[PDB]
Design a protein around this ligand. Structure first.
Ligand SMILES: CCCCCCCCCCCC(=O)OC[C@H](COP(=O)(O)OCC[N+](C)(C)C)OC(=O)CCCCCCCCCCC
Ligand SMILES: CCCCCCCCCCCC(=O)OC[C@H](COP(=O)(O)OCC[N+](C)(C)C)OC(=O)CCCCCCCCCCC
Ligand SMILES: CCCCCCCCCCCC(=O)OC[C@H](COP(=O)(O)OCC[N+](C)(C)C)OC(=O)CCCCCCCCCCC
Ligand SMILES: CCCCCCCCCCCC(=O)OC[C@H](COP(=O)(O)OCC[N+](C)(C)C)OC(=O)CCCCCCCCCCC
Ligand SMILES: CCCCCCCCCCCC(=O)OC[C@H](COP(=O)(O)OCC[N+](C)(C)C)OC(=O)CCCCCCCCCCC
Ligand SMILES: [Cl-]
Ligand SMILES: [Cl-]
Ligand SMILES: [Cl-]
Ligand SMILES: [Cl-]
Ligand SMILES: [Cl-]
Ligand SMILES: [Cl-]
Ligand SMILES: [Cl-]
Ligand code: NA
Ligand code: NA
Ligand code: NA
Ligand code: NA
Ligand code: NA
Ligand code: NA
Lengths: 311, 311, 311, 311, 311
């Protein structure tokens, strides 16, 4: 079997559509997501045309092997899609209507800069390669692009599923390629990060600041060092859920900054003890009283600056 | 091969049934479960009708390729089911009896609000897409819906496996779709959560309250900070067994609330020490004595309020 | 191809045998194990009978497609077995000898009540479904049931591999089903649990009891709280190797009980300090001296009671 | 297709060879390793004899389905090998030369007694079952046994890859079996265990011994209990990399013994404090001074004894 | 089908090219990476030559089964590549142009000596085994070697993808083998290691040095032992992301060295306390004051020495 011949010297237009049935397994570390969807294809093959009267049929059904079908592939997939043909219908003018249901693991880069208050644009790139006989170009049938109402992505909110209607036509290995961009816009469900990571992390930090109302060096060392260790645990927990980035994430910036607060609190606790041993407590008292205001104030201003730089 | 023709203009009814053989791997984080079952299908094909007197045979056995079989699919599966045809039997009137044994990974959302005292309704959605020649509709043969007595789902109690007899008939990509809802009702085995998470978490909290019978600041700081760290460990352990939710779970609410109790206990321990250093121990004594009653009382009332809001 | 016709009115007897080549991956949490074995099948098909003199052969070798073969399945498997036919041999009287080598992941429930001193009976259920033409029944050829001497299951001792010779015949969807039970008896290698979990857990508990020979409240708080935290670590380690059970395991019972010992030790340490602060040390001394005997004695008696209830 | 006929009453000899291309994934806990290799087979089939004059060609190339090929299997594999035929060459006398490239996961037991200074002999067992028409026997073509120079097994040193030339011929399920033993000798790269586990474990133990130069009970309790907790962490880390064994490993013996040293150090610290409180410090001083020598000396002698028993 | 015959006695040249579409899953512990690419092949088959004026067609499209195709394999792959033929084009002179899209898991050793500031050269080895009729040699078509602009490897920077144009021709099991080396040069994104591992590790070490400004033994023991435990946690975290190496890594060297600093700090804290108890504080003061300078100075010089030895 060979591609449909051109009346005149035009490319063969293959109309496409993707209808999402299921969206699952968004892996942050791997920067992948799994998809289960319908892929619809449509093109004109004059060689398959028929007269309805003498045939007695308004439509003709074919097996994929019986007719010419364009070799449509996904660019950003781990392995080739698992596909099963649902229907192949031919109308009198030879207009072919192809429908398959597929499942695929899609590679799509993620921007973690605003994590866990981040939004992403996931991409599904559809592609066709031209043949020596003729050039094959892709188009979007907007009536056949969509998603099931029940489509849910655990830990995320699904905003939209749209297609960039104009294909990216270019040369690859001395043959022309026609590429379409299907976009799935999602926003992260940040809720759980507040009672599980953010507030526990703030509680332990505020607990370390009780050392500014204590003259007991031994108790102060215990307060600041113990809470620091708990902060290390939260830092480790956060970085296990994320890939390594050449940039700072919003959460990563806060976590890093809190180390500086623990480090300066240790210096204060040391300075206070040293002065008291040196029989200079009036002075140590001035530093401790200033610290009671300075630590929460600098923490608030530094957080306003960070939120501003990131959002 | 083509679908059976209508005698007058009626849709083709495909009678269905699912008989569960095995239920395994309920993954909370992934919101999936694996199933091994029998799928039974039945429809009338007059083209296959025969005379039992002349044929001498009461039933005819066919290979799937020899006859027309409806394209039945599962909506909420990761990948297409792994199926093997067991039997195809045709009665003299042309009624076809199809039986296959399949295994599938099913995606079904879970409500964690009442965790670990939660119940779930797992769904298996059966679907058929209508052909151009005629509309295909699904039905439930209640005599072919069930489960093996030995069916067990580790960590859960299986209540029932029933089917919603009325299909959801709708248009999808300019064709009719007939959808059936098979429901597997389960309730979580909460037992082990009591000696492993709930009681150890309560023991460490009550240990922190022994600081209300101690005047030693250094020992009090050690009591409240050490038990807080153990509470952080249990919080981390709990959230690893669960996906991220846009709501609070029952356990998550208790765990979060216990942080406030540790935070206020640190304030009390700090206030007590501060007053004693300021030569005001009579006053510190009043706060400490009140705390001995206030902390268990407020803990009990807050838990009654939470249990009421969640159940 | 169709089943062998009955001479009279008798069911077709299919003689079976399983010879274990490899046993691996016993997953406690999943309640599964992997198996690699030979499956042997034998039945009488008179249509295949031949005269040795006329044919010039004493045995006839066929391909699976050439002859009728019973559809034998495993009940308790995750997915269908990976099988490869080794040989098919027909004797002059039509006695067929079938041999296949297979691999399968088997679901078999485990009783963790006596963990890690538990024994299990793993099951491999062989099944056949009867055809409209005739009833198929399974039998055990004891001469073809066994295991390779080198068969080892890491962390376990293999006791026996036997078959329950009488099948469980029952109706499923108006057809006779014949089920055979192949049993693999195993006992857990508890050795490593002694130096890795049991003795370290006892050492830290005995270390907490040194507080009964100390008047230092601050050192006592450090002794009991630090060892409790180490006990939490061991509790977490143990529950990660096990699924959630609606019952207490032997190890789980000991682990739970040890929390009560830590809790009462904290009360003793608190009571002792309180009395000494109240200028009542003679009294605190009586409680501390009694605790030195009471704690090891109650620990020994409670363990005797537990061992008795579990074994 | 059937096996080659015997001239006179001899078994069919199938010459074998395995050439290792890649060795990877040695899983200690699973006791498996993955292999990618060439499997070469050679046998005489006179029914394939040809005249180069008549056929034109000096060597005939066949497809596996066109000719009789011996059913060669691996004994100790999880699933059947992933194989791809590279060549099937038939010479004029009927000598067949078969070459396939395969990949397989091999189950081979490991002896952890000397871990991490252990060596292993991994096995790949080749097998053939005899047919009714004639007995099949395996042989080793030493010219076709080997490994690529670049073959590396991460964390191990590869010593040799040889074959036991004499097959193990035996009866199994009333037929002959011919088994060959291919051996891959490896030795563990112990280097990294020294700076990562052994020396950090020794440092924390020696830190606990500083308590023998301190009279401060509260500081001593902190020294011995904190380092013990760090030792528990290392014990847990080590046992996660290893399966459960019915014997003690070398590392496991040292780790277990170090607990006794921590336990006796706690007793010493308790005894010292008790005597000082009882106004007997001269006596406490004698025990502490003896401990300074006894602890490192007994540690050295116990380690010499252990190294001797294990190596 | 058989290979193309030689005009004179020249080997058959198969021109190759690899065009990377996707690069993902660089596993450090496994020393593997996944690839999705185009594999292009080109050779001359005179038996396929045709007249362009007579045939009408300028290029002829064949199915893989219709023509002879060289058996091209990858040396360093876990399992055989997942390949799908895109196009086969024959020019009038008989020049065949083969194109397939494949996905493969590649084994390629990694040098961790400079981790996390390391660079790697990943290899993809293409190979062909000669046939009895003629020798097959591989060549690089540089015009068909490349990578998509969007190719990204999470946690790494992709530098170049080039091929060593000269094949490695050698004898293996009495037949010629032609091997090509495709090289993917990458450099690690070290950024995240600085705020997540390096700086937190330095902060805790500097916190341990505050003990040189404290006379309180009990507080000093708490400072040095607590920070040491946090250092153990970071050592464990680092070694989980890496395989076991027969050499020291840069990070591993620093981590190991920091243990010596903690060990000597404990000695200093012990010596200081011992002298003060012995009524020699003027001397303890000299050692403590020297330590304030010695510890940061020796730390800086040791790090300069290490950086010099590794880079
Ligand atoms: C201590 C610091 C605590 C973190 C504060 C939240 C950061 C923030 O302000 O996050 C902001 C994000 C939303 O950002 P967005 O709408 O997606 O940005 C897009 C809009 N632009 C382009 C104009 C920037 O979340 C929220 O509004 C929820 C706030 C939750 C607060 C929980 C605090 C405890
Ligand atoms: C401190 C707080 C401890 C937690 C208390 C259990 C919460 C609860 O009361 O849980 C209640 C659940 C059952 O709820 P259900 O039947 O599934 O709800 C459905 C019914 N409705 C719709 C009317 C609400 O478990 C139990 O009855 C078991 C109680 C175990 C107590 C263990 C305590 C230690
Ligand atoms: C503190 C508590 C320590 C645990 C004590 C072991 C429990 C026990 O006694 O375990 C008993 C089990 C064996 O039980 P079985 O033969 O499989 O039961 C079947 C027989 N029936 C039906 C009659 C009950 O192990 C042993 O004999 C090994 C004992 C190891 C002791 C290690 C102690 C440290
Ligand atoms: C504290 C205890 C530290 C552990 C000491 C190493 C045990 C040992 O001596 O290990 C010995 C093994 C080698 O044993 P092999 O050659 O494989 O035995 C086969 C020979 N036979 C059969 C005669 C027994 O490693 C070495 O030579 C390396 C020594 C590294 C020392 C690191 C110490 C820090
Ligand atoms: C305390 C020690 C902190 C670690 C210091 C970095 C080591 C280093 O100097 O790393 C050097 C590497 C680059 O090395 P390269 O270009 O790949 O080597 C190839 C060149 N040769 C062959 C000539 C050697 O990173 C950098 O330049 C980034 C420096 C980051 C510093 C973060 C410090 C906090
Ligand atoms: Cl694809
Ligand atoms: Cl399906
Ligand atoms: Cl099966
Ligand atoms: Cl019955
Ligand atoms: Cl029946
Ligand atoms: Cl095999
Ligand atoms: Cl390959
Ligand atoms: Na086609
Ligand atoms: Na302390
Ligand atoms: Na069909
Ligand atoms: Na058959
Ligand atoms: Na064959
Ligand atoms: Na070919």
């Amino acid at each position: 079997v060979s591609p449909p011949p051109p009346i005149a010297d035009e490319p063969l237009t293959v109309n496409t559509g993707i209808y999402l049935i299921e969206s699952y397994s968004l892996d942050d570390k791997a920067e992948t997501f799994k998809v289960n969807a319908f892929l619809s294809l449509s093109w004109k093959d004059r060689r398959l045309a028929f007269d309805p009267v003498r045939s007695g049929v308004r439509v003709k059904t074919y097996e994929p092997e019986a007719i010419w079908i364009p070799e449509i592939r996904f660019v950003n997939v781990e392995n080739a899609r698992d596909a099963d043909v649902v229907d192949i219908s031919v109308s009198p003018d030879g207009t072919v209507q192809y429908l398959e249901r597929f499942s695929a693991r899609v590679l799509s880069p993620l921007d973690f800069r605003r994590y866990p208050f981040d939004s992403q644009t996931l991409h599904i790139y559809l592609i066709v390669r031209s043949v020596d006989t003729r050039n094959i170009v892709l188009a979007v049938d907007l009536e056949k692009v969509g998603k099931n109402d029940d489509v849910f992505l655990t830990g995320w909110d699904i905003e939209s599923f749209t297609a960039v209607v104009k294909p990216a036509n270019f040369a690859l290995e001395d043959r022309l390629e026609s590429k379409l961009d299907y976009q799935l816009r999602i926003s992260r469900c940040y809720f759980s990060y507040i009672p599980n990571i953010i507030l526990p992390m703030l509680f332990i930090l505020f607990i370390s600041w009780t050392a500014f109302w204590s003259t007991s060096y031994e108790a102060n060392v215990t307060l600041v060092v113990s809470t620091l260790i708990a902060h290390i645990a939260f830092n480790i927990l956060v970085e296990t859920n994320l890939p390594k980035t050449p940039y700072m994430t919003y959460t990563g910036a806060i976590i890093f900054m809190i180390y500086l607060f623990y480090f300066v609190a240790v210096i204060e606790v040391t300075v206070q003890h040293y002065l008291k041993v040196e029989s200079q407590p009036a002075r140590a008292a001035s530093i401790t009283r200033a610290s009671r205001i300075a630590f929460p104030v600098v923490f608030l201003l530094a957080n306003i600056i960070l939120a501003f730089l990131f959002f």
